[PDB]
Amino acid sequence: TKEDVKSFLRRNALLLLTVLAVILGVVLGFLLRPYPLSPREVKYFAFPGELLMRMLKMLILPLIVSSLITGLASLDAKASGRLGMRAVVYYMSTTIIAVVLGIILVLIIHPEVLDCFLDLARNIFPSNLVSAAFRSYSTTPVGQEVEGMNILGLVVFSMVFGFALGKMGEQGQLLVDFFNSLNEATMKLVAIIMWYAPLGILFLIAGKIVEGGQLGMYMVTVIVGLVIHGLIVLPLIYFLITRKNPFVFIAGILQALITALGTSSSSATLPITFKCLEENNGVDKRITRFVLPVGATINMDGTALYEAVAAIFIAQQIITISITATAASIGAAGIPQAGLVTMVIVLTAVGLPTDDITLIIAVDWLLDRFRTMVNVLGDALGAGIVEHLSRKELEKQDA
Ligand SMILES: COc1ccc([C@@H]2C(C#N)=C(N)OC3=C2C(=O)C[C@@H](c2cccc4ccccc24)C3)cc1
Ligand SMILES: N[C@@H](CC(=O)O)C(=O)O
Numbered sequence: 001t002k003e004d005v006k007s008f009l010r011r012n013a014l015l016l017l018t019v020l021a022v023i024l025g026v027v028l029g030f031l032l033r034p035y036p037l038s039p040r041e042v043k044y045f046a047f048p049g050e051l052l053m054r055m056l057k058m059l060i061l062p063l064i065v066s067s068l069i070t071g072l073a074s075l076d077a078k079a080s081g082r083l084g085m086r087a088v089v090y091y092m093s094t095t096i097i098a099v100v101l102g103i104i105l106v107l108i109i110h111p112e113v114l115d116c117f118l119d120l121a122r123n124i125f126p127s128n129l130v131s132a133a134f135r136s137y138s139t140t141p142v143g144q145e146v147e148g149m150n151i152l153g154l155v156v157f158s159m160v161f162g163f164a165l166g167k168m169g170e171q172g173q174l175l176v177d178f179f180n181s182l183n184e185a186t187m188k189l190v191a192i193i194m195w196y197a198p199l200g201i202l203f204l205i206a207g208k209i210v211e212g213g214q215l216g217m218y219m220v221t222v223i224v225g226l227v228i229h230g231l232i233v234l235p236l237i238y239f240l241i242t243r244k245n246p247f248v249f250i251a252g253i254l255q256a257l258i259t260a261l262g263t264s265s266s267s268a269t270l271p272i273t274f275k276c277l278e279e280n281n282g283v284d285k286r287i288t289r290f291v292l293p294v295g296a297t298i299n300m301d302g303t304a305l306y307e308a309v310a311a312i313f314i315a316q317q318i319i320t321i322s323i324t325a326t327a328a329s330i331g332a333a334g335i336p337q338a339g340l341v342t343m344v345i346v347l348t349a350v351g352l353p354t355d356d357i358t359l360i361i362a363v364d365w366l367l368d369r370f371r372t373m374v375n376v377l378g379d380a381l382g383a384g385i386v387e388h389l390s391r392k393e394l395e396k397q398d399a
């Protein structure tokens with residue numbers, strides 16, 4: 001019994017270091033909290049956590065583009081459509097199951113919007129690809145193009161480009177071979193970036209915990225709702241569909257959930273979720289390159305629940321809330337504080353004052369660290385479900 005735990009410590013070396021990083025980060029952050037805090041000085045303190053974020057952001061661009069180009073090229077017309085339909089149906093249901101779970105819990109325990117739709121439409125079709133790799137569109141930072149990255153515009157273009165090569169046969173093969181080499185090469189860089197994660201995660205959360213009262217019971221509604229949907233609803237869905245153990249599946253992606261908690265960005269933790277599914281859970285690359293990049297921005301289960309709870313909490317009808325909370329879920333990017341920005345849209349539709357968001361902002365960060373964990377988990381189990389379901393398509397692609 002105790003001799004068997006030594007084989008666990010030798011193997012899970014990096015997984016236990018990121019756990020210890022959280023345990024130490026919560027300690028050090030609370031230890032350095034009574035000291036005279038400063039914006040400039042907190043920025044200096046949280047710098048080892050800042051370098052990890054830069055390393056992971058560096059890899060999101062060559063991952064998104066290479067994954068979707070090879071991923072769609074490697075599949076037939078009806079195959080990618082069937083693969084897509086299995087993913088979309090899953091994405092639509094899980095975000096609807098989350099908002100229904102969110103609305104019921106907030107009802108039981110009660111504690112420029114056109115421009116937004118236009119900007120998103122403008123972002124699905126970028127005017128410049130070199131630009132899209134570091135800028136997004138936000139109508140009104142110079143002009144209407146905000147510094148970021150159009151993750152959605154790249155996902156949409158790379159998809160049609162991957163389809164085009166998968167339609168031009170052997171002429172397309174060269175570029176597919178080129179984009180395949182690049183996908184693996186960056187997946188070798190995420191191996192290097194993985195040994196820095198325990199040091200980074202420690203400082204990312206220690207710095208964040210160095211920063212009327214009714215919000216405590218609002219924070220409870222969200223956190224409880226995330227556990228019911230995350231550790232009870234989603235594992236049940238996987239066990240019902242795949243007929244496989246979900247809590248041993250969650251053990252593989254556990255290294256990525258901790259980094260989602262540390263960074264609070266599902267797009268920035270994508271290179272690690274890719275490594276955790278392809279390696280630890282042994283999910284097919286032909287489907288992880290398909291499910292995960294789209295899952296980063298479109299499937300946001302934890303955000304959808306947070307959009308429903310926070311909208312009804314500031315009321316201190318439901319049909320419009322459930323429709324726009326699922327709408328805000330899809331819209332919002334896998335970036336920190338994204339839910340808070342899309343909350344402006346979910347409050348305008350119902351008729352509540354948008355200035356009421358100011359009450360939430362203070363707590364928001366701590367809920368976002370868990371919101372991302374459920375947003376990531378929904379894609380990991382999503383890929384696990386789609387891989388298992390698309391069994392016949394994958395068997396046809398082999399010889
Ligand atoms: C809100 O935006 C999205 C965009 C895509 C998707 C689906 C997805 C996932 N996950 C991925 N990786 O690829 C495809 C999907 C389709 O359903 C459509 C699918 C598809 C089928 C057949 C031909 C295509 C040609 C070009 C692009 C997609 C094509 C590809 C879902 C939501
Ligand atoms: N932080 C979340 C997005 C949000 O703010 O809801 C994510 O990246 O999954």
Ligand code: NA
Binds near residue numbers: 296300329331334
């Ligand atoms: Na989203």
